[PDB]
Design a protein around this ligand. Structure first.
Ligand SMILES: [Zn+2]
Ligand SMILES: [Zn+2]
Lengths: 736, 725
């Protein structure tokens, strides 16, 4: 496996692509070339072979070779690695472009000593890689460009002088992808030079010495990432995609034939959720509920989505076929909540994702909960065959994904807007910033060979499977993977496919346990930091990470950022007193990526199951806890920090009310004073703030403590009574 | 000439994929196989070669060949064409499936005589075609399925007996895409079978005799359509795609190297329109103009669009139904994106059209004239023969009315067959008035693009090359539609449109001949002078032929639903003023029957229909979907109502006024029932009158009845207006 058939592998390449055509007794001229091309990564050679390339070793005038006999007069006029002019007629190395490419090297042993001839041979091979190979997969692209711009803007211009031509050195601005399209040859050459300097033993130090970023790029590219280029090149071939599909299918052939009718049915419903049937819902209703339904104003609730409203309005019809007055009635609201739970589609995977694998979570009705549990355990037993095989060295599988599943907040500004084919770099950098690990609580459905995405899928995952990863095969060339998978993010970059930009995410499957311990360590670390900063007792448990999904590491890292803003925009004493009040009731700041109805701080204090809430944030008085959902996008918010501060507004509301006396079980916003203030300025801030006194107060609080001081002024010039009311409470708390 | 590159070509294939491994009579054996493989369309052999397939002619037990050495015992059990079992070690042919497909044939000299064995070999090759080749491009699919269904539902069950197994005959319903997905072996089998009976000369008559549809399908497939199969197969290959791209790149190399900065700039903005800048618009108001904008009910007028409301509403945060809504009409012209291709599509190529301000009109003309000169080099080259280019298109660009129901309401990966057949019915020719931007090699479509064009260029077609593998073709392109079918790609269904480029003059001639033909028909049916010009086809865009053919259908429904004498009277009046029934695919503000009579440019109106009193003409824009009306027939009848409103008024004072609806003696009637019908009619008396008129002559009698019990006065009033005769 290692250098075992690895050395057997490289010898297979030289076999087919290297033709030793000389007259000076081929024996020493061959070994020489072998030692020459040996410094080149084996994958570069395998990609060349895949591109139909051929390496010809011949003596004499190379321009007289069968392959080069057709070159245009202008092509015989060339330049060397240093930019010096020369003629092919009297040169020793040439890489012929065209889609029947060839690399002609003039036989010689000077390569061992003459490091200037070697350097040039590698420069030409670098041209092959950059111009003839990587172009077939839209590379180099943004990643390499960043390297060029890092040099072009570096302080010590030594890197610029070592690799940039005068044209590049003189470009007035950073090199954009536009520049790359119209000056491909220039980018291609800078690449080849760097590659050459890295491959040639003696010059490598020269590269790392004057072009650090170029050295880092080439070091990581040749030692690691180049295997991915080969994989991606193979993924573009009709016959290689088909061969790979056939071998995976054959590997799961016994498993596929052993599937029962029940097994097959389980995989199908997993892939295709079951919509609720109109009739089944109706017969489950009581006469009183049927009457309540057929007369309820559906399009007036805020607890129902469009699909749901449409579904209900249809049921409303089936029943029928057999300024004031706008809000739902007393029990119409309760009825709709209860109805909401019954109309959700039966979706195995969605159940796992919402619960993060906690399938016993009492967020749904016991009967449905039990059926989900049954299918899950049955699917797990079904997926027992690991991917490991004697047919593939490394296995990569693909997944097109909607960025909104990870962060709907960044998803809103990811696509340019002026040109849909492009991604905004600022949002991209923010997305990538703290993305180191990911978790799949549900069963990932993946493609054997990469396929085209839908408009809303701008994420393209390339996943390296573990040989121990268990999975099942699907006839449409897909695999269903076992639940509870850990993923290490190796690289995140902007790429181009079919003339459209996407975010490539390279990930490696690892044991989920490895990722859970990282989460656990962070939870302990963030508490030690804040217990100290807030002056809370040592060992105090305030912050909880309930993390189980695909953007895991970001949920964790953003919490530090969220609390930093919180402390920066709010008065220390207000933060201490309110927080100490929460801690006195064993409360928690909960950061999670599973839906809120599945967080104990909420569900253990609910009377009925349907009395559940899922949103960006939530403050639960009974448990004195703040819950913040990461992946969702809050209304009128542009940050999770704003969402958190909004909820802290509610806690401040609670504590101020509490300080009023030994009873009240309400909010300071429930005061006759604030109510009147609300009736007056209630609609001068955000629309969401007009919902009720509680929400108006929270919104006012949020805006008054915005990182943007302008937003804070707005509250004073639009809601003067409120601006003063809030500051009155803060002082009331601080002075207490 | 023809066989100059055919015979020598086929021999190159035989050379690569045909290995003769026999005793020593390697001359007669080899020649026999050649005669055998001869009957097969050359393209199948080339496609087999493309997927790595090999053909071996051997002696004795075929299973003893190296290629079938690893064959599992189970696969050694085969069923011949007739469904009878057989043992490979006793058989003469076998096609091994797999990433390294192989075909093994036992050498014989009596294949011409022993037709049943020849039939079996062709059957195995037919299996390679459906199972190993076509499956790589998602075929067979809907087109073939129709053939199957036409066979199982034909009067005589002859065809079934000849080509269907029991699994197929026992099917209770028609074969759906779902059945084909879970019975691929069965479908692939019937295909191979049909293929075989067609290829074996002696068996061709039997096929044609008991299974006509199958014969026709295979006849048209092996004689021409297969060429497209090869083309699509090649379009899957990385190296084939890049080789085609490179030849085209080479052909345009001098053109590309000679491009200036200005030239490149034009090609750029042609691809990406320039949205209006706020700072630019605001600075053009300043004084009272800003004041007016300051406090206006934006989301009120129906003259603006959603995208246009936001921009305007945004102009307010950066600083009505009277003469101020007039201010919005003017502003609407100033906020459009600078989009060259849209301007050409809206005007149908008439760039002098006075539909936008002079400053912008001139800017567009200069850019267009400059682009026309840049694209001077035609694709014709010595580096390649027939070139196909590709284009993904939003169906709403052709017909937004069908486009609303094209995609299955539940499963968006599926196409509604009913709308498909409607869309395809009269789609025979198309015209491009703007610059088509096509892909050298086919690429994936966006969500709202379900049409996939495969266009055969003409060596004379002029184009510009782009670095991203696309070509910008010259404007004024003519296209003949060769085939339209439903296909599957990447788990989604699409509409494949095979079109061939021809001189635009050739298409304009078809439209011109149709205009004379339709006027001859209605001049006779309406009793008008022999050569009057009533109906005009102002056709310039991609759904050209449908605009023309639906005109006949629209007028037939117009006649069949309205009193012959009301029609005759009103039209004679329109002709008296030299009016027209204008069926078009360019926007209304660019017709003439409208713009020559506008007092101001901003007073222009674009919509599904329009009636202009001054020119006595009815204008009907095909491509769009009526914001109210359900179809074009209704759209027309609605406008006719306006014509009636015009004539009736004329018959009350042939020297003053014009509309009976404008009479104060009707306004009141509008005060009562005006809100008792469609919300469109609720707009005003003219629209109400037009709407009421439409309903009364509807094809749905129910509709007719409603106006009776919902608008008893109007129903009696209108019937009194038609009285004027
Ligand atoms: Zn709130
Ligand atoms: Zn009208």
């Amino acid at each position: 496996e290692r250098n075992k058939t690895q050395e057997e592998h490289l010898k297979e390449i030289m076999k087919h692509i290297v033709k030793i055509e000389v007259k000076g007794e081929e024996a020493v001229k061959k070994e020489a070339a072998e030692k020459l091309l040996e410094k080149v990564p084996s994958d570069v050679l395998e990609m060349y072979k895949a591109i139909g390339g051929k390496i010809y070793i011949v003596d004499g005038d190379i321009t007289k070779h069968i392959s080069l006999e057709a070159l245009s007069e202008d092509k015989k006029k060339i330049k060397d690695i240093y930019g010096k002019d020369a003629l092919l007629h009297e040169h020793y190395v040439y890489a012929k472009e065209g889609y029947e490419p060839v690399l002609v090297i003039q036989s010689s042993e000077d390569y061992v000593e003459n490091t200037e001839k070697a350097l040039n041979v590698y420069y030409e091979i670098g041209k092959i890689l950059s111009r003839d190979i990587l172009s077939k997969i839209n590379q180099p692209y943004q990643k390499f460009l960043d390297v060029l711009n890092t040099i072009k803007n570096a302080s010590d211009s030594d890197g610029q002088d070592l690799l940039f031509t005068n044209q590049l050195k003189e470009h007035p601005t950073d090199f954009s992808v536009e520049f790359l399209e119209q000056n491909s040859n220039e980018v291609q050459e800078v690449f080849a030079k760097a590659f050459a300097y890295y491959i040639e033993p003696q010059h490598r130090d020269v590269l790392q010495l004057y072009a650090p970023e170029a050295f880092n790029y080439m070091d990581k590219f040749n030692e690691q990432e180049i295997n991915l280029s080969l994989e991606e090149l193979k993924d573009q071939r009709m016959l290689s995609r088909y061969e790979k599909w056939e071998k995976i299918k054959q590997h799961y052939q016994h498993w596929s034939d052993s599937l029962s009718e029940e097994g097959r049915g389980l995989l199908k419903k997993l892939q295709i959720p079951i919509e609720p049937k109109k009739d089944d819902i109706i017969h489950s209703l009581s006469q009183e509920e049927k009457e309540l339904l057929k007369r309820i104003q559906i399009d007036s609730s805020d607890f129902l989505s469009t699909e749901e409203k449409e579904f209900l309005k249809k049921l409303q019809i089936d029943i029928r076929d057999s300024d004031s007055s706008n809000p739902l009635s007393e029990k119409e609201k309760e009825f709709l909540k209860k109805l909401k739970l019954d109309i959700q589609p039966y979706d195995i995977n969605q159940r796992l994702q919402d619960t993060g694998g906690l399938i016993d979570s009492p967020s749904i009705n016991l009967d449905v909960r039990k059926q989900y549990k049954r299918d899950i355990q049955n699917i797990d037993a079904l997926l027992h065959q690991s991917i490991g095989s004697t047919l593939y060295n490394k296995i990569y599988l693909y997944e097109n994904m909607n960025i909104n599943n990870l962060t709907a907040t960044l998803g809103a500004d990811l696509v340019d807007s002026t040109d849909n084919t492009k991604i905004n770099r600022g949002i991209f950098n923010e997305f990538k910033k703290n993305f180191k690990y990911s978790i799949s609580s549900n069963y990932m459905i993946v493609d054997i060979n990469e396929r085209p995405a839908l408009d809303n899928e701008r994420l393209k995952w390339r996943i390296q499977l573990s040989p121990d990863t268990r999975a099942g095969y699907l006839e449409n060339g897909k695999l269903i993977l076992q639940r509870n998978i850990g993923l290490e993010i190796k690289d995140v970059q902007i790429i181009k496919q079919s003339e459209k930009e996407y975010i490539r995410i390279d990930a490696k499957v690892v044991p989920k346990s490895k990722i859970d311990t990282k989460i656990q360590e962070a939870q302990l670390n963030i508490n030690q930091e804040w217990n100290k900063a807030l002056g809370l007792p040592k060992y105090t448990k305030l912050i909880t990470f309930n993390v189980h999904n695909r953007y895991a590491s970001n949920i964790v890292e953003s919490a530090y950022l969220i609390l930093n803003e919180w402390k920066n925009n709010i008065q220390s004493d207000l933060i201490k007193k309110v927080t100490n009040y929460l801690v006195d009731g064993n409360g928690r700041f909960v950061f999670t990526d599973i839906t809120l109805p599945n967080i104990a701080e909420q569900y253990t204090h609910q009377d009925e199951i349907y009395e559940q809430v899922h949103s960006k944030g939530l403050y639960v008085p009974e448990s004195r806890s703040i819950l913040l959902h990461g992946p969702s996008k809050g209304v009128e918010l542009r940050n999770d920090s704003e969402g958190f501060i909004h909820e802290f507004g509610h806690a401040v509301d609670d504590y101020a009310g509490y300080l009023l006396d030994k009873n009240q079980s309400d909010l300071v916003t429930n005061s006759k004073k604030f109510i009147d203030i609300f009736k007056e300025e209630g609609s001068n801030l955000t629309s969401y703030g007009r919902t009720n006194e509680a929400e108006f107060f929270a919104e006012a609080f949020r805006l008054m403590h915005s990182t943007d001081h302008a937003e804070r002024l707005k509250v004073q010039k639009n809601a003067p009574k409120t601006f003063q009311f809030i500051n009155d409470q803060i002082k009331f708390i601080i002075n207490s």
